[PDB]
Design a protein around this ligand. Structure first.
Ligand code: EPJ
Ligand code: EPJ
Ligand code: EPJ
Ligand code: EPJ
Ligand code: EPJ
Lengths: 206, 207, 204, 207, 207
């Protein structure tokens, strides 16, 4: 019975503690871009509609399908489980994390697939090459806000799962798109925090 | 003797989390009503609408026989209390992705759920040109469940029985004929297959 | 009961979910009060009002005998605790469909509720200025409960909707509310509403 | 005599719902402080103020004797836990309408509460007629309990002794007259009589 | 092998409400880092910033002995679960008071917390312009406890050694000099004395 598996896993659990026997949590992270909504220059910023692909392992979420119902995978609330606190470093002008939220896809293996939608407003830069065919770099910097490389580290979801895959063409381009792993000590706080920053290229399309 | 006796018996056992199923596949008759064309602006590249998402599905866990309640066969229950579909607006949401009100569902003793919340959607579009007073536009709205694939959930388009156009106050521009069509796809992000229904519009002004 | 036993006496068994009666048909007395016309937008063709939603109905379960309590009559309770009507603004609330405040209700031992939430609505109009007329109607109603379950009788617009009206840049010369009943093609039942129609001449 | 232990003593038997007296007529000491004049836009004739609503009242239910505790007394608790005045802005308020924050209150062993939450108010006003200067303006703010009448709740105005302007940073455009004044009315909606304090401001533009 | 062995029992005995001190005066090391200067309006009427409020204080009740943990014992806890300072932006505008996110705190066996939530503040300052590209502006940001005075809580300004500007993103323009300065005052509203740290900025339209 479906309710039988939920109470089994949710019954004891703290979403608060990091999900493993001991260090460290690895998160597969990839950006999908559904639409580049608008970028105005007067504003000097870009508006995007994206999907934040995240998959990680929660051992405390493991179960045996043979035991009840032969249920390999169920869809549970992301509010119920532990999720990584991933923020958009790059100066969201409304909101930093994914606020919708949406359900997570949990597999009997303890593997979580979360893909919430987001509308981000993020600051960009502008190349001057031509008047109409002129260009812009528009970076997007995602990373965990509170967990450092010791506690959480992200493996970049491998640009094979396409940055551009469902992108519906609006007005502008986004020609070269790059994910890049980085790591730093930030001058505030003792630990070193991984990020994946994205570089986009948008050419004014006539 | 009292409806409150039926609230208990229905809610008592229930989990909102699992799809209200027996073994496999929830089906939603899905239909759009349009109250308003609020704004269409070029600057921002979007369209603003006030729509009604009519939804209908059957909840197995929620069936009862009216004789056990009274000569009345339906009560209105909170949409936060029951399982409802995770349907989202794919193309932007500068208001919101899901329906945010959210109103009650009208539950029928047969187990049939009708949920029809109001919504104001801000949805992306490619907005015309100058091209004289006469410039028209497609402006699509793309709906589908976000986490549940076709195995788990599927959408069948209402006969357009929830009327697309009967209650529509004009006030802004056009909506001449607006067309829905079912689709289905795989996305590189998820192994499963997800149905959507996108709705297409046509816009005029008042020349 | 000690002044709190009465909260406890009624709040204890009660459900906010169920329409509050013994049989059928909750009747809600409804009136629109207008405090201010904030703005009427020309380009974007619509009007913004700050209103008071007068609501009155009878909740059976909330009845008591005051003798059993202080002699203090009736009290003010939180609106989230009781059943309140889901009256929504049909008509383009582009900020907000319903009353989002939510202020308290004045509940009487008699089982009578008086709820008057303030609300700020952004509402659609039709053909503006140059002569200069405007439609600017506001359509109110229960969203999920049809006439069978809940129905509205107008606090007469005889009790003036306009007493509190402070005039900004526009008019509101004649504004009249009128009751309707309709079937919508989405839904099999019949749903009553009260539309209030305004006319504003920006009058010099 | 444990500091978190004292909380346990006041909060345990309490309802935020009921007026804190056991008799009649809560008196809330009320005064407006103006920290900043944020913006003045003439088109929509409204004013944006950053204000502090000074409120202090007595909770019968909140007294304790410091001798019985050790750090010892008069500490700050969350404003959500107690009963507080439903004081609202009659005038306009398109962002807040009420305090909507909300801050902590400072509770005194004597049972008296000081709540002083910040607000961003957007409020309407008039330029009046031509012999009032054309670039100067009168701007009123009407504050009061929304659901409680003078019998159940009443306001006594803090004198202009506690300065509206002490925290008033002299901004871009000026403020001259500051007078708050108590009123009471019967409203055609509602049988009772509801006290208010209206504040009337004057603002001249010498740049 | 369980943080819940550790999570539990730390939070278990806890009240978020009372200031976490056996004596008096919890000291918060308080500091700003600037990620981006989003915008300056406008004309009308304000400045927009993307900030990190670096905060550190000591909650003794959050102490545990690390030996009951493997070696380096500090875990990340919900800021919702602990006591956190009520620091607000005094001036604000059409934006928001306090930290509205809000992210996790870094708790040390020492009882020492590191909380550094991101923030988007909209605050004027003063309208500026009047000149051509060469107009300059002084935009201040005043942070401080709202309800807690210096007797109960006080601020030590974090060294500007730990960087204010390192992550300063070019964006649109300016923000060439910043200064933090500690103040303490009596307000005619409130009998005690409330300390603040105000920041003064200078932003030259980037050439
Ligand atoms: Cl509790 C905590 C952890 C980390 C941080 C900061 C350090 C890195 C850079 C910004 C954010 N992440 C701030 N607070
Ligand atoms: Cl559950 C439900 C019932 C009815 C409806 C709609 C039909 C009537 C008019 C609009 C709204 N009310 C929408 N949802
Ligand atoms: Cl948990 C989860 C599963 C699947 C999805 C995806 C399937 C459809 C198309 C994109 C998004 N919605 C997103 N999240
Ligand atoms: Cl429950 C209730 C009672 C009274 C009121 C009204 C009385 C004063 C004036 C408007 C509003 N405040 C509104 N709601
Ligand atoms: Cl409960 C309370 C006490 C005092 C205060 C005020 C004193 C200083 C200046 C504004 C605010 N901080 C605000 N609230």
């Amino acid at each position: 019975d479906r309710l039988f598996k939920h109470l089994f896993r949710g019954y004891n659990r703290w979403a608060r503690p990091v999900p493993n026997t001991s260090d460290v949590v690895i998160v597969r992270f990839g950006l999908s871009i559904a639409q580049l909504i608008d970028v105005d220059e007067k504003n000097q910023m870009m508006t995007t509609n994206v999907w934040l692909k995240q998959e990680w392992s929660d051992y405390k979420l493991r179960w045996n399908p043979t035991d009840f119902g032969n249920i390999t995978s169920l869809r549970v609330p992301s509010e119920m489980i532990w999720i990584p606190d991933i923020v958009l470093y790059n100066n969201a002008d409304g909101e930093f994390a994914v606020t919708h939220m949406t359900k997570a896809h949990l597999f009997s293996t303890g593997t979580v697939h979360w893909v919430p939608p987001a509308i981000y407003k993020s600051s960009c830069s502008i190349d001057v090459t031509f008047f109409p065919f002129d260009q812009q770099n528009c970076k997007m910097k995602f990373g965990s806000w509170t967990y450092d490389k010791a506690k959480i580290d992200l493996e970049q979801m491998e640009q094979t799962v396409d940055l551009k895959d469902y992108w519906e063409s609006g007005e502008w381009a986004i020609v070269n798109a790059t994910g890049t792993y980085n790591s730093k000590k930030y001058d505030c706080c003792a630990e070193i925090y991984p990020d994946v920053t994205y570089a986009f290229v948008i050419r004014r399309l006539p």
